[PDB]
Ligand binder design. Structure first.
Ligand SMILES: CC(C)CN(C[C@@H](O)[C@H](Cc1ccccc1)NC(=O)O[C@H]1CO[C@H]2OCC[C@H]21)S(=O)(=O)c1ccc(N)cc1
Lengths: 99, 99
């Protein structure tokens, strides 16, 4: 699709069998989702947002559907205001910015 | 332009007579620029994301040139770690997400 930006670019994602909502986020390097159970091991990561740096759980090679497109990659789990799909997965679904 | 998302989508902006580098940010309602002086009235605002909230100054009816395109709207100014062009100005230059 072509998504205009008058409203938040919210899409449905599917991860661990659960449907969730997430923001398509060109301003994020990484994908960050609210606390949920994911399979496998995780590793530590510090990410820096508008308010400062926080600790999150980094899960690699996680299967996730984004607006109907399958991606498999890194998902960070931690205290974010809204679920965000960052560039690591936007590239997998072939997303570009256009004007 | 068509901007791929392998790297941060950074562009050159002109604001308050100054050139700055800024991130094109579909994940941000508002545009937020590192602290600087702007002309006219302002009022305080709190904005929150990863890491919590920061206090900013809200200036309305500010003209910015974004990668050669002039837009006008509200600009928030404060201690953001990165200059962010949010949806309020991205709409004005006709920016879309496409996949
Ligand atoms: C968290 C989003 C809901 C909102 N944010 C925009 C977001 O794109 C920021 C924009 C941003 C970008 C860089 C630094 C600080 C903030 N990116 C971000 O937090 O990304 C994190 C996840 O991937 C990492 O790569 C960048 C930082 C990490 S935000 O900066 O916090 C924000 C919040 C409120 C307003 N009004 C305007 C902006």
């Amino acid at each position: 699709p072509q998504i205009t930006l008058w409203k938040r670019p919210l899409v449905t994602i599917k991860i661990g069998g659960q449907l969730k909502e997430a923001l398509l986020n060109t301003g994020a390097d990484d994908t960050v989702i609210e606390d949920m159970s994911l399979p496998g091991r995780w590793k530590p990561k510090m990410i820096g947002g508008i308010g400062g740096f926080i600790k999150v759980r980094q899960y690699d090679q996680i299967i996730i559907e984004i607006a109907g497109h399958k991606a498999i990659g890194t998902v960070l789990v931690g205290p974010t205001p809204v679920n965000i799909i960052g560039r690591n997965l936007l590239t997998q679904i072939g997303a570009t910015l256009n004007f």
